[PDB]
Amino acid sequence: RMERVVRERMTTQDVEAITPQTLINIRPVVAAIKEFFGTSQLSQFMDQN
Amino acid sequence: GSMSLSFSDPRFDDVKAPVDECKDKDMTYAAPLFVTAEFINNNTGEIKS
Amino acid sequence: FKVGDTVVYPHHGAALVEAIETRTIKGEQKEYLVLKVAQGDLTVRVPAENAEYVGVRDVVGQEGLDKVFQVLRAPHTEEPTNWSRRYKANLEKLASGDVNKVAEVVRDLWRRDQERGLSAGEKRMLAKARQILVGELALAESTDDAKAETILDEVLAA
DSSP states (O other): OHHHHHHHHHHHSOTTSOOHHHHOOOHHHHHHHHHHHSSOTTOOOOOOO | OOEEEOOEEEEEOOOSSOHHHHHHTTOOOOOOEEEEOOEEETTTTEEEO | OOTTOEEEOSSSOEEEEEEEEOOEETTEEOOEEEEEOSSSOOEEEEESSSHHHHTOBOOOOHHHHHHHHHHHSOOOOOOOSSHHHHHHHHHHHHHTTOHHHHHHHHHHHHHHHHHHOOOHHHHHHHHHHHHHHHHHHHHHSOOOHHHHHHHHHHHHHO
């Protein structure tokens, strides 16, 4: 998802002005990791009785 | 095929907070990710690291 | 180009070269130069051949100071009545990177807002251009950013 967004913006962005700081959107990675650890079937509360 | 980006060399910082503090203050025990991104323009020729 | 020269590069202001790199590509030893700025903490390697094509510049001269001062003290400036055309025009002025165009932008924007105050978008327009212009003069006459802010405010009132 990050790559898709990066390349779309790169195409829209003007050349000789942009930088990976202006290309990378880090929202998708954070969203994915969050939706994995929280709100997932395979990340369960450690049953510790 | 005029512009390329290669995020590379994943790196990890130190955990923002120790375990018990995270467990008490409801913080997620995490650590930042740092990655050397590199943007290259084919026609003129640069790297933006 | 030599090592240590405080060389100017758009849009990132002045920068320090660190060495002349012989980093080969396709068996051809280009004389790259590594060149780093202080704001973005990024290092840029450019071939010295098309260095002027990409536009690595040198510090604006002292006459450039009085030039943009005359532009900033220049009277008679008016704009299209519709603020949208006005904005897109001076936005292209700031984006062109032309010190002259940028100066027109900031000075006319302040002439408008010193009258009755302007929009927040136009406030940010003034702020970014003021910041980069203040940096440019503060390294051109080595006057410092706070002092460049004070002199920019001095010349706005005229």
